Amino acid sequence: GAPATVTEQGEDITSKKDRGVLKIVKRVGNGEETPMIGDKVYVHYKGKLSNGKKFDSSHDRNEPFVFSLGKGQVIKAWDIGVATMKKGEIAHLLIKPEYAYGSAGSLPKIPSNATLFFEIELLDFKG
């Protein structure tokens, strides 16, 4: 399914080139500009665990998740990944635990050593 496909066919977007965050662009967004550090970004997403189960969705809340890019307000992979996206883009990310919640996990929902899958849509970004 999509998680396997991004695992096997995604692009490494890490600066370290350690394959910790792999990406596929599913829908190409608008123009060439990606957000800048400190921008307010508006995103819809769905996340899955490696047990095959959905663990979260902003779509199901009927409103996007909003954060300031590049400030550690989210897991490292999200800061890295959303920074590569254009407005209107939909992407898949496959994230090893070193760029997510690590050995600690995040109780109750995220186990130790969890690889995470997201479908993410960048709705908007603003200074």
Ligand X SMILES: C=C[C@@H]1[C@H]2CCC[C@@H](C(=O)N3[C@H](C(=O)O)CC[C@@H]13)N2S(=O)(=O)c1cc(Cl)cc(Cl)c1
Chain residues that interact with ligand X, rule: CB under 6 A: 47, 55-56, 65, 74-75, 78, 106, 109-110
Instruction: State the CB neighbour count (10 A cutoff) for residue 51.
Output: 8
Active site residue 18: no
Burial-class residue 108 by CB neighbours within 10 Å (0-12, 13-18, 19+): exposed
List 13, 39, 42, 45, catalytic entry = 45
Which is nearer to ligand X, 30 or 106 (by Cβ)?
106
Active site residue 12: no
Active site residue 65: no
Active site residue 55: yes
> Which structure tokens are listed for 11?
């692009």
Active site residue 67: no
Torsion angle of alpha carbons 87, 18, 98, 115, nearest 10°? 70
List 24, 56, 65, 90, catalytic entry = 56
List 101, 110, 117, 120, catalytic entry = 101
Which is nearer to ligand X, 31 or 108 (by Cβ)?
108
Which is nearer to ligand X, 8 or 60 (by Cβ)?
60
Query: Which residues are annotated as catalytic?
Result: 45, 55-56, 75, 101, 118
